[PDB]
Amino acid sequence: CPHSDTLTIDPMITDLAGETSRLRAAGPLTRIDLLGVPALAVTGHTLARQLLTDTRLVKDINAWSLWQSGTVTRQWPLIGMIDVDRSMFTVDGPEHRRLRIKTTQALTRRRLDALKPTIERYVAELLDDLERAGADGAVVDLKSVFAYPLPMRVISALMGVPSEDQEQLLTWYKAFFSILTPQDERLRVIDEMHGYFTEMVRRKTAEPGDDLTSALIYATDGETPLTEEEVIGNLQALVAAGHETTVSLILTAVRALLSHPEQLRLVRDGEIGWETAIEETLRWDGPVIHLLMRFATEDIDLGDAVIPRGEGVVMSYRAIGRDITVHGADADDFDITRATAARHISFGHGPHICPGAALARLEAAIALPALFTRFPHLHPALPLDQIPNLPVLTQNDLSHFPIHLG
Ligand code: HEM
Ligand SMILES: C[C@@]12CCC[C@H]1[C@@H]1CC[C@H]3CC(=O)CC[C@]3(C)[C@H]1CC2
Ligand SMILES: [Cl-]
C-alpha cells in the first residue's frame, strides 16, 4: 500500500487493527476520508479530553463548511449519523443541559436499581433460549440468541417500546447502520423510524406510563417543557445508542475473556471484579470506533496545528483507547489487571459524555457473570480470530458469534 497524507477509513472493516494503529501513529490529529468526504480525526487521549470541552467545536451541522456549500448532502451514506432531529445530541451550551437533565436523573445508578429486576429476568429468559438452542452439542450463535436481543429489551422497557415492535426496530437499525444499504432505502428507513417514534410520543402523550418517554413528555420540574421534536429526538438517540453499543460491549467482552482464559479465571474466582474486566474491554475493544462529528465555529489554534473554521472533527475513540502515552507500551493488549483500565474515555468526555454509561455497565455486570456461571465450559465453535465485523464504519459491530455450550 502506498503512502498518503489522508487516511481512508475502509467501509468494509477488512483491517481494523492496522487502521487503528495507523491512526495512532499519524495522530494525535490526522486527516481522514469518510466515503470521499474529508475530516480530521482526534486519536490522542489528552488532545481528545481538551477538545471535548472546547466550546468552539459544536455538533450543529449548519456549522459544517461542506454542508453550507452543499457538497455533502443527504446522499452521503453516513449522513444519518449527523443530520438528525433536535436532541441532546445536536445541541451545545445552555440549551444542552435542558435536554439532558431528565435523562441523567433517570439513569442514575440508584434510580436504575428499580430496573435491575427486569434486566435479571431478560438475562435469565435469554439464557434459557441459549440452553435450548445449544442442546445436543449444537453450534449456537451467541449474538442472535442472547447478546443481540438483550439490550433492545432493556432499553425498550425503560423507554416504553411495546414488546411486539422490537423485532421491527432491530430490522430497521441493521439497515440504518449497514453501509451496503442503498441510500434511497436508508433514507426511507430513517423516515419510517421517525414516523414510528412520532406516533409513540403521541400515544404516550395521551396515555402516559411508567417509563422515561412519559417523563420527558411531562415531569416539567418548572422549566420550559420539551418540544415534540425534542422529545422524539431524545427518544431516538436513547434507543439507538442504548441498543447498538451494548450488544458490542457484551460480545467483545466474551471474546476477550474466551481468548484470555487466565483472565476469565481471575473474574470467576473473585480476584478481579467483573466490572474491571468490563472497563478494560471498553478501553481495548469498545463499541464506538469513530464518533461523527464536530465542527469548528472559528479557527482553533493548537500551537503547531490549526483546525480551520468550518472543519469537521471526528473522535476516533478506538485509537484513543490504544493511547500508548497513557496506557504504556502494552496498550494493544487485553489486561484487566492494568492500572489504567478505568481511565479510558470510551463513554466520551465533557458535556456530551454518555448519559447511559451506568446502565451499560449494569447490563454487562449482570449478563456476563450469569452467562459464564450458567455455561462454565462455553467455548468458541469457530476461531475467535475469524469472527468478522459487519460493514459499519463507525461502530464495532460483530457479525455472528458461533459457540458450543460445552
Ligand atoms: C454500552 C456502551 C456504551 C458506549 C461505549 C457509549 C458511548 C457513547 C459516547 C462515546 C458518546 C458521546 C460521544 C461524543 O459526544 O463524543 C455517547 C453518547 C450518548 N449515549 Fe452512550 N454509550 C453506551 C451505552 C449507552 C446507553 C445504554 C445509552 C442509553 C441508555 C446511551 C445513550 C447515549 C446518548 C443519549 C448519548 C448522547 C448524549 C449527548 O450527546 O449529550 N449510551 N455514548
Ligand atoms: C453514535 C451512537 C452510539 C453512541 C451515541 C449514538 C448516536 C446517538 C444519536 C442518534 C441519533 C439518531 O437518531 C441516529 C442514531 C444516533 C446518531 C446514534 C448512533 C450510534
Ligand atoms: Cl506524508
Author numbering: 4 to 409
The authors write:
CYP154C5 from Nocardia farcinica is a P450 monooxygenase able to hydroxylate a range of steroids with high regio‐ and stereoselectivity at the 16α‐position. Recently, the crystal structure of CYP154C5, a cytochrome P450 monooxygenase from Nocardia farcinica, was elucidated in the presence of four steroid substrates. This enzyme catalyzes the highly regio‐ and stereoselective hydroxylation of different pregnans and androstans producing exclusively the corresponding 16α‐hydroxylated products. The active site pocket of CYP154C5 forms a hydrophobic “tube” with two opposite polar regions at both ends. These polar regions are occupied by Gln239 and Gln398 forming hydrogen bond interactions with the hydroxy or ketone functionalities of steroids at positions C3 (via water molecules) and C17.
Moreover, exclusive 15α‐hydroxylation was observed for wild‐type CYP154C5 in the conversion of 5α‐androstan‐3‐one, lacking an oxy‐functional group at C17. To gain structural insight into the altered regioselectivity of wild‐type CYP154C5 in the conversion of 11, the P450 was co‐crystallized with this steroid. The overall structure of CYP154C5 is very similar to the previously determined CYP154C5 structures with Cα‐RMSD values of 0.20–0.37. The electron density of the ligand and the derived model indicate that 5α‐androstan‐3‐one binds in a similar position as androstenedione and testosterone (5), the latter being hydroxylated in 16α position by wild‐type CYP154C5. Interestingly, however, C15 of steroids 4, 5 and 11 in the corresponding crystal structures of CYP154C5 are in a similar position as C16 of pregnenolone and progesterone (3), which are also hydroxylated in 16α position by wild‐type CYP154C5. Hence, the crystal structure alone cannot explain the observed hydroxylation of 5α‐androstan‐3‐one in 15α‐position. Therefore, MD simulations (10 trajectories of 22 ns each) of the compound I state of the CYP154C5 structure with 11 bound in the active site have been performed with scoring of NACs. This way, predicted NAC percentages of 0.31 % for C15 and 15.8 % for C16 were obtained.
